[PDB]
Amino acid sequence: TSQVRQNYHQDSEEAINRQINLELYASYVYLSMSYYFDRDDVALKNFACYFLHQSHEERCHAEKLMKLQNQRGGRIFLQDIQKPDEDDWESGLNAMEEALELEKNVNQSLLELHKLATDKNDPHLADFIETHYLNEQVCAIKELGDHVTNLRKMGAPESGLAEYLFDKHTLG
Amino acid sequence: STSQVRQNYHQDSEEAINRQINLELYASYVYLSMSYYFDRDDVALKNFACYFLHQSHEERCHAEKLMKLQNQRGGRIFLQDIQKPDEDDWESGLNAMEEALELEKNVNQSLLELHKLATDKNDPHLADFIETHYLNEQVCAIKELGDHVTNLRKMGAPESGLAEYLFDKHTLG
Amino acid sequence: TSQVRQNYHQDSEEAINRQINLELYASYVYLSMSYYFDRDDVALKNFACYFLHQSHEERCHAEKLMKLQNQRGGRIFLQDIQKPDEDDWESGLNAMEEALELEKNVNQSLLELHKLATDKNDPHLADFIETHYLNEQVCAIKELGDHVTNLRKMGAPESGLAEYLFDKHTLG
Amino acid sequence: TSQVRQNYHQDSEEAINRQINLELYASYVYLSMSYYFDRDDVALKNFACYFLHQSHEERCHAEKLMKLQNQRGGRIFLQDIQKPDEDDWESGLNAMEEALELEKNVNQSLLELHKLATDKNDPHLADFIETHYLNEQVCAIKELGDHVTNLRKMGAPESGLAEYLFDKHTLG
Amino acid sequence: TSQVRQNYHQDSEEAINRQINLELYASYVYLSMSYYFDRDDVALKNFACYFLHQSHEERCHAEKLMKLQNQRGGRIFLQDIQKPDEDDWESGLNAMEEALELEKNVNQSLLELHKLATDKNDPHLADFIETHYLNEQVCAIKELGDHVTNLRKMGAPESGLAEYLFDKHTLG
Amino acid sequence: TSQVRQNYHQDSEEAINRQINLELYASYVYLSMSYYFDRDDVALKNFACYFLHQSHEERCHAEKLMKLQNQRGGRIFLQDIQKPDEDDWESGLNAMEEALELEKNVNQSLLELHKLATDKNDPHLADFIETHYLNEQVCAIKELGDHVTNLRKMGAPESGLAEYLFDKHTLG
Numbered sequence A, C, D, E, F: 001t002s003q004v005r006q007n008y009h010q011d012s013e014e015a016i017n018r019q020i021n022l023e024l025y026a027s028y029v030y031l032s033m034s035y036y037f038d039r040d041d042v043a044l045k046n047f048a049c050y051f052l053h054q055s056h057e058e059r060c061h062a063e064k065l066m067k068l069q070n071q072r073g074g075r076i077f078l079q080d081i082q083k084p085d086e087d088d089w090e091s092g093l094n095a096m097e098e099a100l101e102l103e104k105n106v107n108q109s110l111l112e113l114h115k116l117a118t119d120k121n122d123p124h125l126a127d128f129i130e131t132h133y134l135n136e137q138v139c140a141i142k143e144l145g146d147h148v149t150n151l152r153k154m155g156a157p158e159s160g161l162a163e164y165l166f167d168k169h170t171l172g
Numbered sequence B: 001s002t003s004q005v006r007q008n009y010h011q012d013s014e015e016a017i018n019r020q021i022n023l024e025l026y027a028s029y030v031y032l033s034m035s036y037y038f039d040r041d042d043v044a045l046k047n048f049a050c051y052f053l054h055q056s057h058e059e060r061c062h063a064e065k066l067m068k069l070q071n072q073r074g075g076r077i078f079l080q081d082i083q084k085p086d087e088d089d090w091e092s093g094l095n096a097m098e099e100a101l102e103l104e105k106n107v108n109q110s111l112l113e114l115h116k117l118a119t120d121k122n123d124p125h126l127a128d129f130i131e132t133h134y135l136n137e138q139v140c141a142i143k144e145l146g147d148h149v150t151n152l153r154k155m156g157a158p159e160s161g162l163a164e165y166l167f168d169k170h171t172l173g
């Protein structure tokens, strides 16, 4: 047992290792979307920049959980980072819809982690999840919803003009 | 199916670039694992942790630049799973530096094979890209890791915990 | 023989004279495109500025090759600069497609020059072409591909609105 | 007919296309002369810089006529740019004498262009040629005459000392 | 075998040790030339300064090859540095002609070293020689041929006035 | 006989040429030591930096003597620079002991040169050696003795820890 470990359930330690993997997985999905928009036959530079920024933020989300595992005296066990479900993300609107679904899936995992921390009477871990993850998730999900709504109302994805102008005026 | 930009870019080179993107992401993940080993309360060498986190971010840059190259030449990125590292516990500062040295020589071997493929397919843009952005970076990385291994061994690591502590402070700090 | 000449094949010297001509030709094509977009019945000022910049860069490409010829002790022999294939470039989209074909033709010529340098064991000339020309050509072709993709997706050339907005938001 | 065209004779439009060709020809002659002086067996760097500057100014002279053609509603028709009459310009003095001759030939063309504008009652074109071209030519011809006079008095082209000192003290 | 050594042929290691000696020999030749021009019976201070600068640059060329040898895991074996072929360099023109011959001999040795790197499939060593040495050699050879041409055209070495004015106006 | 020469014995001239050689020799020993410490299997960067700075200072000692030879109207005759006695300097302590022996040998040569200047009644040369060389040698020998003492007392060369900490805290 770590000399630092106090009130830190084995189930919590294991759940943090699963969440670390899911944040790295989210980083990889965003990295894939980024370079889709960099293709010469897609060529939406601000979509590319937006998703690359998201990719770097997900890596920070993972690193902060690795720091938490060590702060609580848990042991990090990394797993393979699975490749994203798509190679071709089809359109700006479809990438934003896939990102929205990804962020709600990550949020569901964080809410299960919070329930576990509550069930094991771990108020430090509950507070860490509320403070650093749950509001960030609600803000990310609201921003992706707003982007989806605008792209739909503009006529995406059938209007290439719509995706071009969204790229310039919202993401640029 | 052929990109409007594609010129003198062999399908074998496009595939070799997808394999190299995977290996650079792999190397990033190895260095991330090493970084958080040294952050453990029972290891607690912060400058080793910082050194390997910096290496992790640089390997991510190496991957992103190859993804940019793929699209520049009109090839198509196909990502694969990023395999977890061979170890969870890296044992010591010396053992982590020896594992990083082996990793960097394995990455360099892959880059030399990619350069040979660019040469055999008469792709001088790709040959130049690999020489300019990867091959001297690898030779510099391998020489630094060799220098670090030598100093740790000469100081008495890994048995001398005093050695790794003082190396952490005076070389990596 | 020049007092500076060393390891510089006659074939290489001749191929550098043909490349000087091709860079001046490319400069002239872009000058013609530039002033097409300046016509009162075309009036896309950022297309004009974009192609005039490209024309000035091709002149620089020519001058640097003339400098190389003298550095290696070859002798510059200039040839007529042929006028471009069109007087009327039709549309923003058509000029960009014509520029993309021109840059791929210039790249083919540079790759033949690199092969000749390699075949004559001229590592100085190989390196010169790689360092100053081959990566510039890859960047130029990618940028022109991106521009063609955006114009097509926006509905060019039939949409005069598409060419107007592209002129403003991408080239402006 | 262009919606902008007013008081612009077809002959004047055709004369401006001929003058664009002649300005681009002059630019090419000066570029040739520049890289002659850069040869390892000539090696007068301030002659080289002087002539390259003159090359770049002639390109500006051509672009300004292209702008004028579009301003008046005429249509630009480019022609091949003929290579210069020499590959080897022989000496600093001979280059300066050939430049003087070239500038007097361009001046003669500009004076015929002015007579045409006067004969067609085109005072805008007459003014444009007087304002932008005729005093520049008189200044250029006077400077080239001054340079020829000094190189001759100094002992050029037989004195290699003369050309070296002129390069340093007048052109440097 | 060094723990760093990878794809580095013994022949390449030995060729690098030979090139280190040749760069140190070139440094020594230029040091000799420098102090010939500092003699009270020669007294061309800018020739002295020019050659001493060339001497310090050759020392940098040697040091960078010593670094390369250790970077690749090869072992530096230093050899005697042979004194230059002359004690008395006769004139400014003669020193410049000897320097041009020296820089072409060093270039031939670097081209041989590049061929060896190519034959041993050592692209890192090939790129190192092209990046740091081959273009520097072409620039040095072009500069020395320019200097020889000017001194000859001015009347050197028989004109002590020529060498005096070249020392002031080109090297000062 | 040089027009500047006064009270400058042939024996003094010859001794100055021998001292120039010895200073160049010392520069080469320190260069060799420098790149020994840069080897991947030695890797003491501050030892490397220390010895390279010494190498550059010995070069300055040789150049100032060449200047003196010319100031006095003597004639420089350069000799081969012999390679150092070792390729492998074994340890930081062994390198410092070898440097101490070298500096005492150079000092002995300078003391014999001073005796020559005294025996030939050359007060200018006597003062030159005292002012520029003898106090510098005393300072270099004391510094090297202090470094040898500290390395021995720390437990070098058997303690790799000693040489590491000396590199950081004394040379760094």
Ligand SMILES: [Fe+3]
Residues within 6 Å of the ligand: A023, A026, A057, A058, A061, A106
């Ligand atoms: Fe996240």
Ligand SMILES: [Fe+3]
Residues within 6 Å of the ligand: B024, B027, B058, B059, B062, B107
């Ligand atoms: Fe990498």
Ligand SMILES: [Fe+3]
Residues within 6 Å of the ligand: C023, C026, C057, C058, C061, C106
């Ligand atoms: Fe070009």
Ligand SMILES: [Fe+3]
Residues within 6 Å of the ligand: D023, D026, D057, D058, D061, D106
């Ligand atoms: Fe003009």
Ligand SMILES: [Fe+3]
Residues within 6 Å of the ligand: E023, E026, E057, E058, E061, E106
């Ligand atoms: Fe050199």
Ligand SMILES: [Fe+3]
Residues within 6 Å of the ligand: F023, F026, F057, F058, F061, F106
């Ligand atoms: Fe000394």
Ligand SMILES: [Mg+2]
Residues within 6 Å of the ligand: A054, A057, A058, A140
């Ligand atoms: Mg985010």
Ligand SMILES: [Mg+2]
Residues within 6 Å of the ligand: A080, B081
């Ligand atoms: Mg797996």
Ligand SMILES: [Mg+2]
Residues within 6 Å of the ligand: B055, B058, B141
């Ligand atoms: Mg690295």
Ligand SMILES: [Mg+2]
Residues within 6 Å of the ligand: C054, C057, C058, C140
């Ligand atoms: Mg361009």
Ligand SMILES: [Mg+2]
Residues within 6 Å of the ligand: C080, D080
């Ligand atoms: Mg013709």
Ligand SMILES: [Mg+2]
Residues within 6 Å of the ligand: D054, D057, D058, D140
């Ligand atoms: Mg002018």
Ligand SMILES: [Mg+2]
Residues within 6 Å of the ligand: B127, C126, E126
């Ligand atoms: Mg190559």
Ligand SMILES: [Mg+2]
Residues within 6 Å of the ligand: F054, F057, F140
């Ligand atoms: Mg010293």
Ligand SMILES: [Mg+2]
Residues within 6 Å of the ligand: E080, F080
């Ligand atoms: Mg000898």
